[PDB]
């Protein structure tokens, strides 16, 4: 689709068997999801954003379905105030910014 | 422009006669720029993102060019890690997300 930006670009995602709402964020390097369980090994990471850093758990090779589109990649889990789909998965669903 | 997301969507902006680099961010409500001098009065604002909140100065009716497109709107100034172009100005330049 073509999403206008008059409102936040929120979509429904499926991850780890759960439905969630998430923000399509071209200004995010990574995909960051609120606390949930995911399978496999993980490692701690610090990520930064507008107000400083948070600590997250990094899981690899996770499949997410994003507004109907499947993609695979790294997902970070931690105390983010909003679920965000960042560039690592936006590229996989072929998303572009156009003007 | 059609901007893919394999790299950060960094563009050149012009504000106050000066060229700066900024990130096009569909996950940002507002436009936030690093400390600089802007004309007129300002008002206080708090904005929040992944690592918490920061205090910024809100300037209205600022003339700004984004990747060559002219806009006039609100710019927040404060200790952001990166200059961010948010939806308030991405809608002025007619940007959409497409997949």
């Amino acid at each position: 689709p073509q999403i206008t930006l008059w409102k936040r670009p929120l979509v429904t995602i499926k991850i780890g068997g759960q439905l969630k709402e998430a923000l399509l964020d071209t200004g995010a390097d990574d995909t960051v999801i609120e606390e949930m369980s995911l399978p496999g090994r993980w490692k701690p990471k610090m990520i930064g954003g507008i107000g400083g850093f948070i600590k997250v758990r990094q899981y690899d090779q996770i499949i997410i379905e994003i507004a109907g589109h499947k993609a695979i990649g790294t997902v970070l889990v931690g105390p983010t105030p909003v679920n965000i789909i960042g560039r690592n998965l936006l590229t996989q669903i072929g998303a572009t910014l156009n003007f | 422009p059609q901007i893919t997301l394999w790299k950060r969507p960094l563009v050149t902006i012009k504000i106050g006669g000066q060229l700066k680099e900024a990130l096009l961010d569909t996950g940002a409500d507002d436009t936030v720029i690093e400390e600089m001098s802007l004309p007129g009065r300002w008002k206080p604002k708090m904005i929040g993102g992944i690592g918490g909140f920061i205090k910024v100065r809100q300037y209205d009716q600022i003339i700004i060019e984004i990747a060559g497109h002219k806009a006039i709107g609100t710019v927040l100034v404060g200790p952001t890690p990166v200059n961010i172009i948010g939806r308030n100005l991405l809608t002025q330049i007619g940007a959409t997300l497409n997949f």
């Binding site: 964020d25 930064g48 954003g49 965000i84 | 604002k45």
Partner: peptide, 11 residues
């Protein structure tokens, strides 16, 4: 590491 910029105003 890795920087992630969602933002919203205020309260």
């Amino acid at each position: 590491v890795s920087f992630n910029x969602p933002q919203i105003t205020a309260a």
